[PDB]
């Protein structure tokens, strides 16, 4: 960064094969884009034009901004319930 509002970059450090239809598959060295931390183990992100889930333990997130703290932390309950559903 500074990244402002843009998605965070990460690189795959290990190969990963997706085990469900929601999960991205990628090879070590791949460039990944991260939109939002879903949980300690998982991100919502993008690889090769396709949005899906990416496991935290298979990647290295690139440095800096904060900023990134919002996208890097899972959304809290109180944040989600602050607005009605669509």
Swiss-Prot record:
> Where does the record place the SH3 domain?
6-64
Q: Where in the cell does this protein reside?
A: Cell membrane; Cell projection, Dendritic spine; Postsynaptic density; Postsynaptic cell membrane
Give the sites modified to Phosphoserine: 72
Q: Which residues cross the membrane?
A: none
Q: Which disease is it linked to?
A: A chromosomal aberration disrupting SRGAP2 has been found in a patient with early infantile epileptic encephalopathy. Balanced translocation t(1;9)(q32;q13).
Question: Please, what other remarks does the record include?
Answer: There are 3 duplications of SRGAP2 in the human genome as a result of segmental gene duplications. SRGAP2C is the only one to be fixed at a diploid state in the human genome. Moreover, SRGAP2C is functional, interacts with and inhibits SRGAP2 and is human-specific. The appearance of SRGAP2C in the human genome is estimated to 2,4 million years ago, which corresponds to the beginning of neocortex expansion in human evolution and it may have played an important role in this process through its interaction with SRGAP2 function.
Q: How are the domains described in the entry?
A: The F-BAR domain mediates oligomerization, binds membranes, and induces plasma membrane protrusions.
Q: What does this protein do?
A: Postsynaptic RAC1 GTPase activating protein (GAP) that plays a key role in neuronal morphogenesis and migration mainly during development of the cerebral cortex. Regulates excitatory and inhibitory synapse maturation and density in cortical pyramidal neurons.
Quaternary state and partners of this protein?
A: Homodimer. Heterodimer; forms a heterodimer with SRGAP2C, altering SRGAP2 function. Forms a heterooligomer with SRGAP1 and SRGAP3 through its F-BAR domain. Interacts (via SH3 domain) with GPHN. Interacts (via SH3 domain) with FMNL1 (activated by RAC1); regulates the actin filament severing activity of FMNL1 and actin dynamics. Interacts (via SH3 domain) with FMNL3. Interacts with RAC1; specifically stimulates RAC1 GTPase activity. Interacts (via F-BAR domain) with HOMER1. Interacts with ROBO1 and ROBO2. Interacts with FASLG. Interacts with PRMT5.
Give the protein's recorded name. Answer: SLIT-ROBO Rho GTPase-activating protein 2
Can you name the source organism? Homo sapiens
Q: Which residues of the full protein are shown?
A: 729 to 809 of 1071
